[PDB]
Amino acid sequence: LQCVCLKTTSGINPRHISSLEVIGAGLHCPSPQLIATLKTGRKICLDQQNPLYKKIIKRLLKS
Amino acid sequence: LQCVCLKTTSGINPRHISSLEVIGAGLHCPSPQLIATLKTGRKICLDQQNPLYKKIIKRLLKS
Amino acid sequence: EDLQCVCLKTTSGINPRHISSLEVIGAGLHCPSPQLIATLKTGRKICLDQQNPLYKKIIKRLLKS
Amino acid sequence: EDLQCVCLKTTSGINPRHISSLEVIGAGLHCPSPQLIATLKTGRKICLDQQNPLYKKIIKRLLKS
Numbered sequence: 001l002q003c004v005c006l007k008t009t010s011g012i013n014p015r016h017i018s019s020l021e022v023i024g025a026g027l028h029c030p031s032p033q034l035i036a037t038l039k040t041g042r043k044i045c046l047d048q049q050n051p052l053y054k055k056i057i058k059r060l061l062k063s
Numbered sequence: 064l065q066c067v068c069l070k071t072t073s074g075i076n077p078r079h080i081s082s083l084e085v086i087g088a089g090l091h092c093p094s095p096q097l098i099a100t101l102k103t104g105r106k107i108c109l110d111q112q113n114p115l116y117k118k119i120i121k122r123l124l125k126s
Numbered sequence: 127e128d129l130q131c132v133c134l135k136t137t138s139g140i141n142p143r144h145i146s147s148l149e150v151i152g153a154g155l156h157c158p159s160p161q162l163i164a165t166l167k168t169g170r171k172i173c174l175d176q177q178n179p180l181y182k183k184i185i186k187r188l189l190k191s
Numbered sequence: 192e193d194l195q196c197v198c199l200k201t202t203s204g205i206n207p208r209h210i211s212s213l214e215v216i217g218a219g220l221h222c223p224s225p226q227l228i229a230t231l232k233t234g235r236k237i238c239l240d241q242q243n244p245l246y247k248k249i250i251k252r253l254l255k256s
């Protein structure tokens with residue numbers, strides 16, 4: 001089918017993230033999809049091009 | 064602005080859905096969001112106009 | 127054996143309007159029963175009982191906007 | 192006390208090619224430890240060991256176009 005993450009964002013605070021999901025590319029979407037869940041319930045798409053996502057993964061692996 | 068769901072789908076088979084999340088409108092996104100995760104780990108957005116979602120809630124709960 | 131259900135117990139006095147998200151998980155190898163996890167806007171997470179129509183009120187409330 | 196850890200046991204013998212998605216969940220009220228849940232292409236879920244680098248390879252794989 002198709003990508004869900006058509007619009008990505010970087011205007012977010014690592015500290016507000018509670019979880020991150022990486023969906024690999026395949027027939028449904030030619031690129032990886034990174035969906036972050038804020039602590040308040042909201043979900044946003046991250047851009048793999050920004051390294052923000054690597055900071056998120058370190059903070060999550062810490063706590 | 065920061066919506067995950069920019070484009071929906073009404074073409075799926077509920078059999079394939081492992082979970083459904085209902086997100087309310089807020090500051091990131093002005094409209095409710097219906098994200099379905101397929102058994103494979105892939106996500107799709109559903110239309111709240113189409114009641115397939117209702118079909119899907121029923122099936123997940125009485126399963 | 128590898129994984130267990132995330133929901134220990136269910137809660138029932140919540141106000142449909144304190145919820146920012148509702149997640150419906152089917153039964154599977156991961157957990158033998160379907161689960162209803164609601165996120166309060168405060169970030170607290172609770173599980174609801176599918177045998178309480180409260181979840182239907184939340185879903186109605188969440189689709190509003 | 193409504194939620195608990197879903198990850199009981201971790202797995203180390205998986206082919207990075209079988210994984211379709213990975214979820215990293217930080218610690219909090221629900222579980223005092225982070226959890227790495229992978230969904231294989233088969234619909235099956237498993238927990239990865241973070242103090243093992245099998246997960247590093249998977250991340251790298253999942254990030255390729």
Ligand code: TCN
Binds near residue numbers: 196199
């Ligand atoms: N009950 C329980 Ni746990 C177990 N076994 C874990 N890990 C938790 N929380």
